[PDB]
Design a protein around this ligand. Structure first.
Ligand SMILES: O=C(O)CNC(=O)C(=O)O
Ligand SMILES: [Mn+2]
Length: 339
Protein backbone atom coordinates (compact mmCIF):
# COMPACT_ATOMS: atom_id res chain seq x y z
CA UNK A 1 0.00 0.00 0.00
CA UNK A 2 1.80 3.12 -1.29
CA UNK A 3 1.01 6.73 -0.43
CA UNK A 4 -1.56 7.00 -3.23
CA UNK A 5 -3.45 3.81 -2.43
CA UNK A 6 -3.53 4.89 1.22
CA UNK A 7 -5.16 8.26 0.52
CA UNK A 8 -7.47 6.65 -2.07
CA UNK A 9 -8.67 4.04 0.44
CA UNK A 10 -9.06 6.66 3.18
CA UNK A 11 -11.17 9.08 1.18
CA UNK A 12 -13.27 6.21 -0.18
CA UNK A 13 -14.25 5.29 3.42
CA UNK A 14 -14.15 8.84 4.82
CA UNK A 15 -17.09 10.07 6.90
CA UNK A 16 -18.65 13.27 5.49
CA UNK A 17 -18.92 16.21 7.88
CA UNK A 18 -16.19 14.96 10.20
CA UNK A 19 -12.55 16.00 10.29
CA UNK A 20 -11.69 13.21 7.83
CA UNK A 21 -12.17 15.80 5.06
CA UNK A 22 -10.35 18.58 6.90
CA UNK A 23 -7.32 18.36 4.62
CA UNK A 24 -9.36 18.47 1.40
CA UNK A 25 -8.73 21.75 -0.41
CA UNK A 26 -11.94 23.63 -1.29
CA UNK A 27 -11.24 26.21 -4.00
CA UNK A 28 -14.72 27.74 -3.62
CA UNK A 29 -13.60 29.05 -0.19
CA UNK A 30 -10.21 30.25 -1.44
CA UNK A 31 -11.21 33.93 -1.81
CA UNK A 32 -11.61 33.93 2.01
CA UNK A 33 -7.79 33.41 2.09
CA UNK A 34 -7.92 31.30 5.24
CA UNK A 35 -4.37 30.15 5.97
CA UNK A 36 -3.55 26.66 4.61
CA UNK A 37 -3.64 23.77 7.06
CA UNK A 38 -0.27 22.13 7.82
CA UNK A 39 0.66 19.39 5.37
CA UNK A 40 -1.36 20.91 2.50
CA UNK A 41 0.05 22.73 -0.55
CA UNK A 42 -0.60 26.45 -0.84
CA UNK A 43 -3.40 27.81 -3.03
CA UNK A 44 -2.13 30.62 -5.27
CA UNK A 45 -4.20 32.74 -7.63
CA UNK A 46 -3.52 32.28 -11.35
CA UNK A 47 -4.06 35.33 -13.59
CA UNK A 48 -6.19 34.81 -16.69
CA UNK A 49 -6.03 36.62 -20.01
CA UNK A 50 -9.22 38.57 -19.38
CA UNK A 51 -9.03 40.27 -22.79
CA UNK A 52 -8.60 37.02 -24.73
CA UNK A 53 -12.34 36.10 -24.67
CA UNK A 54 -15.11 38.63 -25.25
CA UNK A 55 -18.09 38.96 -22.95
CA UNK A 56 -20.60 37.99 -25.63
CA UNK A 57 -18.52 34.93 -26.58
CA UNK A 58 -18.32 33.88 -22.93
CA UNK A 59 -22.07 34.43 -22.72
CA UNK A 60 -22.76 32.27 -25.78
CA UNK A 61 -21.74 29.18 -23.78
CA UNK A 62 -23.11 30.29 -20.40
CA UNK A 63 -19.82 31.55 -18.96
CA UNK A 64 -19.32 34.64 -16.85
CA UNK A 65 -16.95 37.13 -18.45
CA UNK A 66 -13.36 36.04 -17.85
CA UNK A 67 -12.83 39.15 -15.71
CA UNK A 68 -15.22 37.67 -13.11
CA UNK A 69 -13.47 34.26 -12.97
CA UNK A 70 -11.27 33.14 -10.10
CA UNK A 71 -8.58 30.66 -11.15
CA UNK A 72 -6.13 29.03 -8.77
CA UNK A 73 -2.98 26.98 -8.92
CA UNK A 74 -1.27 24.70 -6.42
CA UNK A 75 2.31 25.23 -5.34
CA UNK A 76 4.09 22.02 -6.29
CA UNK A 77 1.84 21.33 -9.30
CA UNK A 78 2.82 23.71 -12.13
CA UNK A 79 0.32 23.92 -14.97
CA UNK A 80 -2.66 22.84 -12.83
CA UNK A 81 -5.55 25.34 -12.98
CA UNK A 82 -8.84 25.20 -11.05
CA UNK A 83 -11.78 27.50 -11.80
CA UNK A 84 -14.70 27.37 -9.37
CA UNK A 85 -18.11 27.38 -11.11
CA UNK A 86 -17.83 30.34 -13.53
CA UNK A 87 -21.17 29.61 -15.18
CA UNK A 88 -23.88 32.21 -15.56
CA UNK A 89 -26.94 31.45 -13.39
CA UNK A 90 -28.90 28.45 -14.63
CA UNK A 91 -26.42 27.75 -17.45
CA UNK A 92 -25.16 24.49 -15.92
CA UNK A 93 -28.62 23.06 -16.68
CA UNK A 94 -27.97 23.24 -20.42
CA UNK A 95 -24.65 21.41 -20.22
CA UNK A 96 -26.08 18.79 -17.85
CA UNK A 97 -29.07 18.29 -20.15
CA UNK A 98 -26.66 17.88 -23.06
CA UNK A 99 -24.64 15.18 -21.28
CA UNK A 100 -27.71 13.19 -20.24
CA UNK A 101 -30.04 13.62 -23.24
CA UNK A 102 -28.00 14.58 -26.34
CA UNK A 103 -24.38 13.39 -26.11
CA UNK A 104 -25.56 9.97 -24.89
CA UNK A 105 -27.30 9.38 -28.22
CA UNK A 106 -26.10 7.67 -31.35
CA UNK A 107 -24.00 8.36 -33.27
CA UNK A 108 -21.71 8.80 -30.25
CA UNK A 109 -20.42 5.73 -28.40
CA UNK A 110 -21.24 4.70 -24.84
CA UNK A 111 -20.83 1.78 -22.47
CA UNK A 112 -24.29 0.38 -23.32
CA UNK A 113 -23.47 -0.23 -26.98
CA UNK A 114 -21.47 -3.45 -26.60
CA UNK A 115 -24.49 -5.53 -25.49
CA UNK A 116 -27.54 -3.42 -26.29
CA UNK A 117 -28.84 -2.60 -29.74
CA UNK A 118 -29.60 0.89 -31.01
CA UNK A 119 -33.32 0.13 -30.67
CA UNK A 120 -32.87 -0.98 -27.06
CA UNK A 121 -30.95 2.16 -26.09
CA UNK A 122 -32.79 4.73 -28.25
CA UNK A 123 -35.61 4.99 -25.71
CA UNK A 124 -33.17 6.03 -22.97
CA UNK A 125 -34.63 9.48 -22.42
CA UNK A 126 -38.30 8.56 -22.86
CA UNK A 127 -37.84 5.72 -20.38
CA UNK A 128 -36.68 8.18 -17.71
CA UNK A 129 -39.45 10.72 -18.41
CA UNK A 130 -42.05 7.96 -18.01
CA UNK A 131 -40.82 6.82 -14.58
CA UNK A 132 -41.16 10.41 -13.35
CA UNK A 133 -44.75 10.73 -14.61
CA UNK A 134 -46.25 7.56 -13.11
CA UNK A 135 -48.42 7.00 -10.04
CA UNK A 136 -47.67 3.25 -9.94
CA UNK A 137 -44.00 4.38 -9.47
CA UNK A 138 -41.55 2.29 -7.34
CA UNK A 139 -41.62 -1.54 -7.34
CA UNK A 140 -37.94 -2.30 -6.60
CA UNK A 141 -37.19 -1.26 -10.15
CA UNK A 142 -34.12 -2.35 -12.14
CA UNK A 143 -31.67 0.39 -13.03
CA UNK A 144 -32.92 2.58 -15.87
CA UNK A 145 -30.92 3.07 -19.07
CA UNK A 146 -29.92 6.53 -17.81
CA UNK A 147 -28.81 4.92 -14.57
CA UNK A 148 -26.68 2.29 -16.36
CA UNK A 149 -24.76 4.93 -18.34
CA UNK A 150 -21.08 4.98 -17.28
CA UNK A 151 -19.13 6.60 -20.14
CA UNK A 152 -19.68 8.39 -23.42
CA UNK A 153 -16.99 9.20 -25.98
CA UNK A 154 -17.08 12.01 -28.56
CA UNK A 155 -14.87 13.00 -31.49
CA UNK A 156 -12.11 10.42 -31.77
CA UNK A 157 -13.58 7.57 -29.76
CA UNK A 158 -11.14 6.32 -27.16
CA UNK A 159 -10.61 2.58 -27.45
CA UNK A 160 -10.68 1.10 -23.97
CA UNK A 161 -9.06 -2.19 -24.95
CA UNK A 162 -6.07 -0.94 -26.97
CA UNK A 163 -5.93 2.33 -24.98
CA UNK A 164 -5.44 4.23 -28.24
CA UNK A 165 -7.25 6.68 -30.49
CA UNK A 166 -7.63 6.03 -34.20
CA UNK A 167 -8.62 7.95 -37.30
CA UNK A 168 -10.91 5.07 -38.29
CA UNK A 169 -13.31 5.73 -35.39
CA UNK A 170 -14.69 9.25 -35.25
CA UNK A 171 -17.98 11.09 -34.80
CA UNK A 172 -17.90 14.88 -35.31
CA UNK A 173 -17.36 16.59 -31.97
CA UNK A 174 -20.46 18.50 -30.80
CA UNK A 175 -19.94 22.14 -31.66
CA UNK A 176 -21.41 23.74 -28.55
CA UNK A 177 -19.08 21.76 -26.28
CA UNK A 178 -16.18 22.55 -28.62
CA UNK A 179 -16.89 26.29 -28.44
CA UNK A 180 -17.13 26.04 -24.64
CA UNK A 181 -13.80 24.18 -24.48
CA UNK A 182 -12.20 26.78 -26.74
CA UNK A 183 -13.25 29.72 -24.51
CA UNK A 184 -11.94 28.01 -21.35
CA UNK A 185 -8.73 27.09 -23.15
CA UNK A 186 -8.18 30.60 -24.54
CA UNK A 187 -8.99 32.25 -21.20
CA UNK A 188 -6.21 30.10 -19.68
CA UNK A 189 -3.69 31.19 -22.33
CA UNK A 190 -4.08 28.28 -24.79
CA UNK A 191 -5.50 29.76 -27.98
CA UNK A 192 -5.95 27.35 -30.86
CA UNK A 193 -7.25 24.46 -28.77
CA UNK A 194 -8.69 21.65 -30.90
CA UNK A 195 -11.55 19.85 -29.11
CA UNK A 196 -10.84 16.48 -30.69
CA UNK A 197 -11.74 13.76 -28.14
CA UNK A 198 -14.37 13.81 -25.41
CA UNK A 199 -14.73 11.31 -22.59
CA UNK A 200 -17.79 11.80 -20.39
CA UNK A 201 -18.01 9.89 -17.08
CA UNK A 202 -21.26 9.29 -15.20
CA UNK A 203 -20.82 8.67 -11.46
CA UNK A 204 -23.24 7.17 -9.00
CA UNK A 205 -22.61 7.76 -5.31
CA UNK A 206 -20.57 4.56 -5.01
CA UNK A 207 -18.64 5.10 -8.27
CA UNK A 208 -14.85 5.50 -8.32
CA UNK A 209 -12.11 6.21 -10.84
CA UNK A 210 -8.72 4.62 -10.15
CA UNK A 211 -5.19 6.00 -10.34
CA UNK A 212 -4.14 6.76 -13.93
CA UNK A 213 -2.43 9.30 -16.14
CA UNK A 214 -4.05 10.51 -19.35
CA UNK A 215 -1.25 9.79 -21.79
CA UNK A 216 -3.13 8.28 -24.76
CA UNK A 217 -3.35 11.55 -26.71
CA UNK A 218 -0.55 12.08 -29.21
CA UNK A 219 0.27 15.67 -28.13
CA UNK A 220 1.15 16.02 -24.44
CA UNK A 221 1.83 19.75 -24.71
CA UNK A 222 -1.84 20.46 -24.88
CA UNK A 223 -4.10 21.04 -21.86
CA UNK A 224 -6.78 18.59 -20.75
CA UNK A 225 -10.15 20.16 -19.86
CA UNK A 226 -12.38 18.72 -17.14
CA UNK A 227 -15.90 19.87 -16.25
CA UNK A 228 -17.97 18.77 -13.28
CA UNK A 229 -21.71 18.91 -12.66
CA UNK A 230 -23.86 17.61 -9.83
CA UNK A 231 -22.71 16.06 -6.59
CA UNK A 232 -19.25 16.91 -5.35
CA UNK A 233 -16.24 14.66 -5.79
CA UNK A 234 -12.98 14.19 -3.92
CA UNK A 235 -10.21 14.48 -6.50
CA UNK A 236 -6.68 13.22 -5.84
CA UNK A 237 -3.83 14.88 -7.77
CA UNK A 238 -0.53 13.02 -7.45
CA UNK A 239 2.87 12.94 -9.10
CA UNK A 240 4.64 11.58 -12.16
CA UNK A 241 5.16 8.21 -10.46
CA UNK A 242 2.22 6.22 -9.07
CA UNK A 243 3.45 6.25 -5.44
CA UNK A 244 3.98 9.94 -4.63
CA UNK A 245 1.44 11.08 -2.04
CA UNK A 246 -1.40 13.06 -3.68
CA UNK A 247 -3.27 16.23 -2.70
CA UNK A 248 -7.03 16.04 -2.17
CA UNK A 249 -9.38 18.73 -3.42
CA UNK A 250 -13.10 19.10 -3.95
CA UNK A 251 -14.74 19.29 -7.35
CA UNK A 252 -18.14 20.95 -6.99
CA UNK A 253 -20.89 21.52 -9.54
CA UNK A 254 -19.68 23.84 -12.29
CA UNK A 255 -15.99 23.55 -11.36
CA UNK A 256 -13.47 23.34 -14.21
CA UNK A 257 -9.97 21.88 -14.13
CA UNK A 258 -7.27 22.51 -16.71
CA UNK A 259 -4.34 20.12 -16.48
CA UNK A 260 -1.74 21.98 -18.53
CA UNK A 261 2.03 21.88 -18.63
CA UNK A 262 3.78 19.68 -16.07
CA UNK A 263 0.41 18.74 -14.54
CA UNK A 264 -0.79 17.23 -17.85
CA UNK A 265 0.85 13.86 -17.16
CA UNK A 266 0.27 13.56 -13.40
CA UNK A 267 -1.41 10.58 -11.75
CA UNK A 268 -4.89 11.34 -10.44
CA UNK A 269 -8.08 9.62 -9.32
CA UNK A 270 -11.48 10.23 -7.77
CA UNK A 271 -11.98 7.91 -4.77
CA UNK A 272 -15.32 9.42 -3.69
CA UNK A 273 -18.47 11.15 -4.89
CA UNK A 274 -20.00 12.68 -1.76
CA UNK A 275 -23.78 12.83 -1.29
CA UNK A 276 -25.40 16.16 -0.66
CA UNK A 277 -25.29 16.92 3.10
CA UNK A 278 -29.14 16.91 3.42
CA UNK A 279 -29.39 13.59 1.54
CA UNK A 280 -30.83 13.44 -1.99
CA UNK A 281 -30.65 17.13 -2.92
CA UNK A 282 -29.13 19.31 -5.61
CA UNK A 283 -26.35 21.78 -4.86
CA UNK A 284 -27.70 25.31 -4.70
CA UNK A 285 -26.29 26.49 -8.05
CA UNK A 286 -28.47 23.95 -9.87
CA UNK A 287 -31.67 25.46 -8.40
CA UNK A 288 -31.26 28.70 -10.35
CA UNK A 289 -33.23 28.48 -13.62
CA UNK A 290 -32.14 29.49 -17.09
CA UNK A 291 -32.93 33.10 -18.07
CA UNK A 292 -36.39 33.70 -19.51
CA UNK A 293 -34.98 35.23 -22.72
CA UNK A 294 -31.60 33.98 -23.98
CA UNK A 295 -29.20 36.19 -25.95
CA UNK A 296 -29.06 36.12 -29.70
CA UNK A 297 -27.19 33.18 -31.23
CA UNK A 298 -26.78 31.48 -27.87
CA UNK A 299 -25.19 28.05 -27.71
CA UNK A 300 -26.90 27.58 -24.37
CA UNK A 301 -30.41 26.43 -25.30
CA UNK A 302 -33.68 26.56 -23.36
CA UNK A 303 -34.35 23.59 -21.08
CA UNK A 304 -37.94 22.39 -20.79
CA UNK A 305 -39.71 21.81 -17.48
CA UNK A 306 -40.10 18.13 -18.31
CA UNK A 307 -36.43 17.76 -19.35
CA UNK A 308 -35.01 19.44 -16.27
CA UNK A 309 -37.15 17.21 -14.05
CA UNK A 310 -35.27 14.17 -15.36
CA UNK A 311 -31.85 15.84 -14.92
CA UNK A 312 -32.68 17.07 -11.43
CA UNK A 313 -33.86 13.75 -10.03
CA UNK A 314 -30.85 12.09 -11.65
CA UNK A 315 -28.27 14.56 -10.34
CA UNK A 316 -29.45 14.15 -6.72
CA UNK A 317 -27.42 10.91 -6.56
CA UNK A 318 -24.96 11.38 -9.42
CA UNK A 319 -22.09 13.42 -10.81
CA UNK A 320 -21.31 14.10 -14.47
CA UNK A 321 -17.78 14.78 -15.66
CA UNK A 322 -16.86 16.06 -19.13
CA UNK A 323 -13.26 15.87 -20.26
CA UNK A 324 -12.12 17.41 -23.56
CA UNK A 325 -8.76 16.71 -25.16
CA UNK A 326 -6.75 17.57 -28.22
CA UNK A 327 -5.47 14.31 -29.70
CA UNK A 328 -3.22 15.34 -32.62
CA UNK A 329 -0.48 17.93 -32.53
CA UNK A 330 -1.15 20.64 -35.08
CA UNK A 331 0.44 19.61 -38.36
CA UNK A 332 0.37 15.92 -37.39
CA UNK A 333 -1.86 13.01 -38.43
CA UNK A 334 -2.16 9.58 -36.94
CA UNK A 335 0.77 7.75 -38.57
CA UNK A 336 -0.30 5.53 -41.47
CA UNK A 337 0.39 1.92 -40.90
CA UNK A 338 3.14 -0.10 -42.58
CA UNK A 339 2.77 -3.48 -44.22
O1 LIG B 1 -13.88 12.42 -12.82
C1 LIG B 1 -13.02 13.31 -12.76
O2 LIG B 1 -13.20 14.42 -12.19
C2 LIG B 1 -11.69 13.06 -13.41
N1 LIG B 1 -11.81 12.29 -14.64
C3 LIG B 1 -10.72 11.86 -15.28
O3 LIG B 1 -9.62 11.87 -14.77
C4 LIG B 1 -10.78 11.35 -16.64
O4 LIG B 1 -11.87 11.33 -17.26
O5 LIG B 1 -9.70 10.97 -17.12
MN1 LIG C 1 -7.99 11.44 -16.15
Amino acid sequence: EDAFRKLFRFYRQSRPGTADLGAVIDFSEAHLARSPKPGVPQVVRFPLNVSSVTERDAERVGLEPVSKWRAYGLEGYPGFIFIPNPFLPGCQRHWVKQCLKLYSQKPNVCNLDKHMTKEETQGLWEQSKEVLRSKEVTKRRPRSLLERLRWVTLGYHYNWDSKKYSADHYTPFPSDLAFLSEQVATACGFQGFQAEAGILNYYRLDSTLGIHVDRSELDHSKPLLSFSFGQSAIFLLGGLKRDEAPTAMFMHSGDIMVMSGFSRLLNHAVPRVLPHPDGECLPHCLETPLPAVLPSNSLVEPCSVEDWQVCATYLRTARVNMTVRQVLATGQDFPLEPV
